Write an enzyme that holds these catalytic residues in place. Structure first.
Site, PDB file in Angstrom:
ATOM      1  N   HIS A  16       0.498  -1.348   0.083  1.00 46.76           N
ATOM      2  CA  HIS A  16      -0.099  -0.010  -0.174  1.00 46.76           C
ATOM      3  C   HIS A  16       0.978   1.381  -0.071  1.00 46.76           C
ATOM      4  O   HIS A  16       2.099   1.487   0.180  1.00 46.76           O
ATOM      5  CB  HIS A  16      -0.556   0.484   0.956  1.00 46.76           C
ATOM      6  CG  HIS A  16      -2.038  -1.009   1.201  1.00 46.76           C
ATOM      7  ND1 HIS A  16      -3.059  -0.884  -0.053  1.00 46.76           N
ATOM      8  CD2 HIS A  16      -2.463  -2.198   1.628  1.00 46.76           C
ATOM      9  CE1 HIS A  16      -3.973  -1.621   0.531  1.00 46.76           C
ATOM     10  NE2 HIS A  16      -3.508  -3.081   1.594  1.00 46.76           N
ATOM     11  N   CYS A  35      -0.299   2.561  -3.908  1.00 48.49           N
ATOM     12  CA  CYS A  35      -0.924   3.877  -4.570  1.00 48.49           C
ATOM     13  C   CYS A  35      -0.636   5.263  -4.150  1.00 48.49           C
ATOM     14  O   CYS A  35       0.665   4.579  -3.015  1.00 48.49           O
ATOM     15  CB  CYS A  35      -2.245   3.968  -3.559  1.00 48.49           C
ATOM     16  SG  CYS A  35      -3.230   2.275  -4.377  1.00 48.49           S
TER      17      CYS A  35
HETATM   18  C1  LIG Z   1      -8.075  -4.667  -5.067  1.00 40.27           C
HETATM   19  C2  LIG Z   1      -9.325  -4.329  -5.101  1.00 40.27           C
HETATM   20  C3  LIG Z   1     -10.392  -5.159  -5.462  1.00 40.27           C
HETATM   21  C4  LIG Z   1      -8.795  -3.163  -3.213  1.00 40.27           C
HETATM   22  C5  LIG Z   1      -9.231  -2.795  -5.949  1.00 40.27           C
HETATM   23  N1  LIG Z   1      -9.266  -3.735  -6.865  1.00 40.27           N
HETATM   24  C6  LIG Z   1      -9.832  -3.796  -8.166  1.00 40.27           C
HETATM   25  O1  LIG Z   1     -11.880  -3.105  -7.756  1.00 40.27           O
HETATM   26  C7  LIG Z   1     -10.588  -4.292  -9.202  1.00 40.27           C
HETATM   27  C8  LIG Z   1     -11.528  -5.370 -10.234  1.00 40.27           C
HETATM   28  C9  LIG Z   1     -11.105  -5.372 -11.343  1.00 40.27           C
HETATM   29  C10 LIG Z   1     -10.147  -5.656 -11.956  1.00 40.27           C
HETATM   30  N2  LIG Z   1     -10.399  -5.815 -12.859  1.00 40.27           N
HETATM   31  C11 LIG Z   1      -8.819  -5.236 -11.685  1.00 40.27           C
HETATM   32 CL1  LIG Z   1      -7.479  -4.398 -12.984  1.00 40.27          CL
HETATM   33  C12 LIG Z   1      -9.739  -4.109 -10.096  1.00 40.27           C
HETATM   34  C13 LIG Z   1      -8.534  -2.234  -6.227  1.00 40.27           C
HETATM   35  O2  LIG Z   1      -6.978  -2.650  -6.489  1.00 40.27           O
HETATM   36  N3  LIG Z   1      -8.139  -0.550  -5.122  1.00 40.27           N
HETATM   37  C14 LIG Z   1      -9.086   0.300  -4.533  1.00 40.27           C
HETATM   38  C15 LIG Z   1      -9.053   1.420  -4.954  1.00 40.27           C
HETATM   39  C16 LIG Z   1      -7.775   1.689  -4.912  1.00 40.27           C
HETATM   40  C17 LIG Z   1      -7.304   0.101  -5.243  1.00 40.27           C
HETATM   41  C18 LIG Z   1      -6.235  -0.050  -4.807  1.00 40.27           C
HETATM   42  O3  LIG Z   1      -6.301  -0.844  -3.807  1.00 40.27           O
HETATM   43  N4  LIG Z   1      -4.521  -0.029  -4.569  1.00 40.27           N
HETATM   44  C19 LIG Z   1      -3.849   0.078  -3.698  1.00 40.27           C
HETATM   45  C20 LIG Z   1      -2.710   1.437  -3.206  1.00 40.27           C
HETATM   46  O4  LIG Z   1      -1.930   1.255  -1.865  1.00 40.27           O
HETATM   47  C21 LIG Z   1      -2.468  -0.503  -4.672  1.00 40.27           C
HETATM   48  C22 LIG Z   1      -2.362  -1.862  -4.338  1.00 40.27           C
HETATM   49  O5  LIG Z   1      -2.676  -2.871  -3.260  1.00 40.27           O
HETATM   50  O6  LIG Z   1      -0.918  -2.521  -4.803  1.00 40.27           O
END
Ligand SMILES: CC(C)(C)[C@H](NC(=O)c1ccc(N)c(Cl)c1)C(=O)N1CCC[C@H]1C(=O)N[C@H](C=O)CC(=O)O
Lengths: 88, 174
Positions: free
Chosen positions: B114, B162
């Site tokens: 994160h 992020c």
């Molecule tokens: C994993 C999750 C369910 C939390 C979400 N992903 C999807 O909802 C998804 C659904 C279908 C898809 N094809 C793809 Cl690709 C993704 C996601 O990633 N986020 C949600 C908001 C910010 C961002 C996040 O958590 N960013 C981290 C920052 O710190 C980066 C890190 O942890 O590496």
């Protein structure tokens, strides 16, 4: 005899999004940026230097897809092209 | 055309194309050390399980992919998991002290966690008590003063994290 060297040189950093912005990760398929970087390294390490490969990764993100992000290269002090010459 | 070798799925540079590149701008390419004797190192730090932040499910796919890729490119890969920012600093200082960098031409460092605007989250991070590693500290620990063995050699830092809470988009009229 002693000689002076630049204290910071020959760095490149590559971040998964622009400042203030999220990067995306698929819960079973992995981080989008990581998967895209691996694909581009596999395809282009033979022919492009690392800065050019990172640019191509950037280009691959150019149109948003509901989960937009733009990788950013930062703090670059590479003075030469870094070719990986895979196989040598 | 086989992915059976040490390079796996990385497309190979033919020695035709290699000396083509090496003769077009030789004065502007980082030198590669002899494959038979060089000792390239890479370091992957990945935080998946946190004390107060949701788990980064899928992180293991990232570890697997980056570890195999960096090995394919010729690096011996150290993988460290679920570290505090202090643990990360200690691991980076140890990595900077590794004797193999002397007989290496380059290094890769990969960080996956994160993140917030200020940097990368350690294992124990919360907004109550932040546990953050700044990119500036990473550079300082690998620079010519603190890692003289990598002087004049490319140091590639990859960060999956992020950088804030915003979606990274604005609307425009089509
Ligand atoms: C994993 C999750 C369910 C939390 C979400 N992903 C999807 O909802 C998804 C659904 C279908 C898809 N094809 C793809 Cl690709 C993704 C996601 O990633 N986020 C949600 C908001 C910010 C961002 C996040 O958590 N960013 C981290 C920052 O710190 C980066 C890190 O942890 O590496």
């Amino acid at each position: 005899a002693i000689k002076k060297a630049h204290i910071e040189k020959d760095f490149i950093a590559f971040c998964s999004s622009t400042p203030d912005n999220v990067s995306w990760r698929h819960p079973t398929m992995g981080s989008v940026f990581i998967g895209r970087l691996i694909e581009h390294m596999q395809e282009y390490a033979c022919s492009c230097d690392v800065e050019e490969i990172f640019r191509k990764v950037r280009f691959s993100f150019e149109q948003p897809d509901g989960r937009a992000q733009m990788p950013t290269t930062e703090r670059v002090t590479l003075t030469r092209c870094f070719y990986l010459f895979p196989g040598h | 055309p086989t992915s059976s070798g040490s390079e796996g799925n990385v497309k190979l540079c033919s020695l035709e194309e290699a000396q083509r590149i090496w003769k077009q701008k030789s004065a502007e390419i980082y030198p590669i050390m002899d494959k038979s004797s060089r000792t390239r190192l890479a370091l992957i730090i990945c935080n998946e399980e946190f004390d107060s932040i949701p788990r980064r499910t899928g992180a293991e796919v990232d570890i697997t992919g980056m570890t195999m890729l960096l090995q394919n490119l010729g690096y011996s890969v150290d993988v460290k998991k679920n570290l505090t920012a202090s643990d990360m600093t200690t691991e980076l200082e140890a990595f900077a002290h590794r004797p193999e960098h002397k007989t290496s031409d380059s290094t890769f460092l990969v960080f996956m966690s994160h993140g917030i605007r200020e940097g990368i989250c350690g294992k124990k991070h919360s907004e109550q008590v932040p546990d953050i590693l700044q990119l500036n500290a990473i550079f300082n620990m690998l620079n010519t003063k603190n890692c003289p063995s990598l002087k004049d050699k490319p140091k590639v830092i990859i960060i999956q994290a992020c950088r804030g809470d915003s979606p990274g988009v604005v609307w425009f009229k089509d």
